[PDB]
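Record type: ASSEMBLY
Status: queued
Input:
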Amino acid sequence: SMIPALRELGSATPEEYNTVVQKPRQILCQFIDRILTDVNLTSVMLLDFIQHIMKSSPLMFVNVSGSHEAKGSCIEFSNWIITRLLRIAATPSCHLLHKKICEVICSLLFLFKSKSPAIFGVLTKELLQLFEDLVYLHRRNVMGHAVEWPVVMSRFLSQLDAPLQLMSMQNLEFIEVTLLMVLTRIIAIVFFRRQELLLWQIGCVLLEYGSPKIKSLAISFLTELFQLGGLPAQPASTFFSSFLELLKHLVEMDTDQLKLYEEPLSKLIKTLFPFEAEAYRNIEPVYLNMLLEKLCVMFEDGVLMRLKSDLLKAALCHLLQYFLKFVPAGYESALQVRKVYVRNICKALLDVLGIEVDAEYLLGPLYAALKMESMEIIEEIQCQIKHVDMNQKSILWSALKQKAESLQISLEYSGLKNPVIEMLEGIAVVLQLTALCTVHCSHQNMSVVITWMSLDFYTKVLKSCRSLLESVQKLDLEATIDKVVKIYDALIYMQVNSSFEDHILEDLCGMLSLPWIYSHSDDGCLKLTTFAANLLTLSCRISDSYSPQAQSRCVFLLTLFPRRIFLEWRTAVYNWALQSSHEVIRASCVSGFFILLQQQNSCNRVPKILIDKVKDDSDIVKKEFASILGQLVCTLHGMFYLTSSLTEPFSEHGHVDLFCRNLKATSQHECSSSQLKASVCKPFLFLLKKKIPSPVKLAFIDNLHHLCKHLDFREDETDVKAVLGTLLNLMEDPDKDVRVAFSGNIKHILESLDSEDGFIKELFVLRMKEAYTHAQISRNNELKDTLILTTGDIGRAAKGDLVPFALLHLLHCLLSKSASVSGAAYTEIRALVQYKKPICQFLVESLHSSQMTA
Amino acid sequence: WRQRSNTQGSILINLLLKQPLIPGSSLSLCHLLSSSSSFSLSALREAQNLAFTGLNLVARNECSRDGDPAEGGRRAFPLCQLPGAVHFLPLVQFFIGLHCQALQDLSVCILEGFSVTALSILQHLVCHSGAVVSLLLSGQGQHPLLKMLLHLLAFSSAATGHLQASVLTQCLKVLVKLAENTSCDFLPRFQCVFQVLPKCLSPETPLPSVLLAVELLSLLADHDQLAPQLCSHSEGCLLLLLYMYITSRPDRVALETQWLQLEQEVVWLLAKLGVQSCQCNVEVVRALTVMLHRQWLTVRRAGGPPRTDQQRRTVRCLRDTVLLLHGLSQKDKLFMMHCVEVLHQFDQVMPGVSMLIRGLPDVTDCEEAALDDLCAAETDVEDPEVECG
Amino acid sequence: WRQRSNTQGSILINLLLKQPLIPGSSLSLCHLLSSSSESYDGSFSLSALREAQNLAFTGLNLVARNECSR
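Status: finished
Output:
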């Protein structure tokens, strides 16, 4: 390359800058002619060299001064380069080169926008016009007007030059795809609230016509456009119609086509229908009604059954949920029409429920509809506590009961009907939804109680669980175990609500311990256990079916087991959990022992055995133990009465199963006494890792926010010293986000401290001083920022002397006047709302330091 | 394209027949078309009949048929001609004039409510209807309804009261839509509405109306003549008032997300002015730095990614405001002196937004470079350590 | 066959539209859909009239959108 030409580029005057560029521009044009001129995937070397020159000689691509003449000349030269790039792009064979060409051209355009905003605006207008012409050509081809497959389609024409070739209709589609990729890259720079309509037009037309994969890329571009600036009403009608058409087509699509369009299709489904509130207003009411109608058609089509892509079925379910929950009834359409369309969608949902690949997809929407019917029942109660059966109350609920009774009846009826893993999965989805409703349906749960499945139905389900306990030849033993686990979790949630039966509780504990029973049969509680006796034989089979992650789910359920029943069997199961042969098994073991320990006996500090396992179990195990520790501290001596949140499964935690796992238990009177124990904090600190637990540390701070309120504040100076050491460690953590979280929790802690103890305040000031000294030693702006945020949290506390100390820290930054620090003190008073008087004293200190200077 | 988008040819014929486009008050565009109760009040029912004919035509009228090929022009999404829609306009004029007449008078609040419903009907008409836009543009006795929108906007601009306030918002929606569908040439004709806008720019003016106004000011600014209008007075740009409304955060009632929306709108306006082809300028940089500071602080406190849509908008506005700052910096050094008074807040916010940007896949080379130009803050004045803590 | 059916549906919308439904008759379809309600009242609440009115509005928009099956 002409490196001396590159140097002359800097040397040349802005007026002669055009001539200076022409010299190396000459070599660049020759290089393009070598490869760019010929149509044809070295040339990649050429495009990379183009990008390297753009980075090296920003002035060469665009004159810095411009002068109003050199700038135009650069516009022409870049237009010629873009013409060569498009010449490369149009051909499908060289399309791959065009994308890297896309990268170079887009980077140079960004560079021009930086240096030459106006010239870049002109180039972008030319690009948008070229896009409009390509869309017009596509429209003429599709509508049936003259194809005009060869055309100059000249745009951003440059006198210095080359010719802009036109691809055959399909290759023109390819060139349009490349233009769409470039526009997707540059969307943010382009959008001006006026060209926005043009971008929406290019996208909507591309959605209407073009390759299904090109259609998918266009869907992605339209999604990015929708995220920024919404959907303009004029674009809205066409985009909504195209979305309805795509929804109808989804059934009649190629599996490869489905794979091409899935991710973009799901992204559009989500962005256009955000689960978050206030999405409803964004789309027009009639458009939303049309979405509901197309969904009704899809449900009639059984698109769930037709769909060969899970993510697409997932997005269809997402639309169902958006209509059920986030779209107010009476906005998209009249109430009764909404109820009718929803009833049809629910009927289709049950039809899919009959045979299911995965229950979760059907789970959520049925959950929302059951919640809506529950609110209806609650309104019935509101206007003139007698339980009304859920199945009788709601047609959909009785329908689900019929489907479940049918699945169980078929399993009992035939051995081949007995071997229907999908039918069991459906029965399981029914049970889980039943448990979620029993948790949340009751208006008193939100007087009358509605149980979709009666306890006798639960017992028939128990008989079905026994049939599943019957060996399946081990071909599906593990999956049968997983489904039995989901059913057991549903029964467990029902028990946490209230134990279904004491013998039912015993049978449940037996099924839960079945996988490891064969190993645990020689156990003191086990041999006594009546369930154990009959169980041992199947456990001989069950042990093979049991798997590590499934075993961990089993251990979690066992910890769920009520203490009243098989408590010693539970303690043995926890001890086996202490074994932690499987790491995920170890994690579930921690989660479960968390409940089991306090129930067993001797309400007191965390078990030393569990503490040791936490000492080194795993990084993930460390995080799970941290998450548990918050509740464990509240429940160390608390009765720990089980508490069930509604937990609407909009984004169910982990698997929809383990929902029983994601439960919270609180003692009524534990809040009465904080009962802070330093050593208990000491084990948590031993769990904490300066860097290893860092995200686990953030979770630990998150739990500490809750834990702090239950802090006795009666600790000895050594114990208060220990808590202050925990806080200083919270500050020390390397993660800046870690420190910000530390201050966030520090707010709750300062609220928690019984009083702004003068000695405690002095210790806090000393910790801050050690931190600032370590900062000055670091000479690290980031540590300075962490300390500044710490002082800001202290001021937001504004607690007692701590309020004066945090004012002193704000004064420290201000006298430091650190460019970042400055104004944070202004926020500091804002966080505030005598401290200011210490500020004047610190100003006196500033005067003394200045006198020291002179 | 077998479907032919016949409904797209429909000018929201359903949108016309729906509950009040303005939320609440049960305006009932049907109730208006059928209402028993400006000038020529008699034969208000004759105008109503014109509107019923128009509705039938719009239902039967599909100018945007088989992709609207006859539709043509520079404007994107050219609305179907929908000539029948036009007939609706005399009726709208009737109630709009009723409101205008109330304004001319120095009692009938409900009367104004129908007027707001009519503003909404005109809003729906400007949308999806090409003929209405062309007529309003063609129009001095020109576009009498356009003058009525202007005079109504004015009457609201001063002593609006609660009734006028919503009328301000809706009429702004119409004035902006009529502009968006309009060509550049039309914008020379709306420069008069540009004359009306300043009063809306006032701090007393609510946040929503001024958001509609910022969008409108940009759409006008697309036209060169309106562009000189963008700052008709050198001493005080309408943009100067806009920066003042941005900083002042005067409307407490507005939710933070609405402030974000006004923020990105003004970012877009500053950008559109950025592509051409005062006390207002220094203030612009002060306001830009404070806005970037508030948004970047919100982002900084949160280690978690911007999962929610509004945080996503927040990261995006952080990026684009970064670009606007980089451009203001490159154009001149005056920003730095203007930056001086808020220089500390600026140099504090800019590194943080810069790093949050740095931690992005979507980054442009352009936006990274925009930071690179700036993002030189020592953040250490370097005083003695003793007596600070 | 939908397009001719769509014409039929638009025709239904137009019949719903006409200014006088019965000649010399003051009331018009929109007058019914949104009404003063001046005045079975015991059977029918003004709110009951209102909810039915909303159902009617949704229906009118639907009928306009719809294409005839024929």
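Annotation: The first strand of chain A starts at residue 641 and ends at 643.
Annotation: Residues 135 and 511 of chain A are 64 Å apart (CA to CA).
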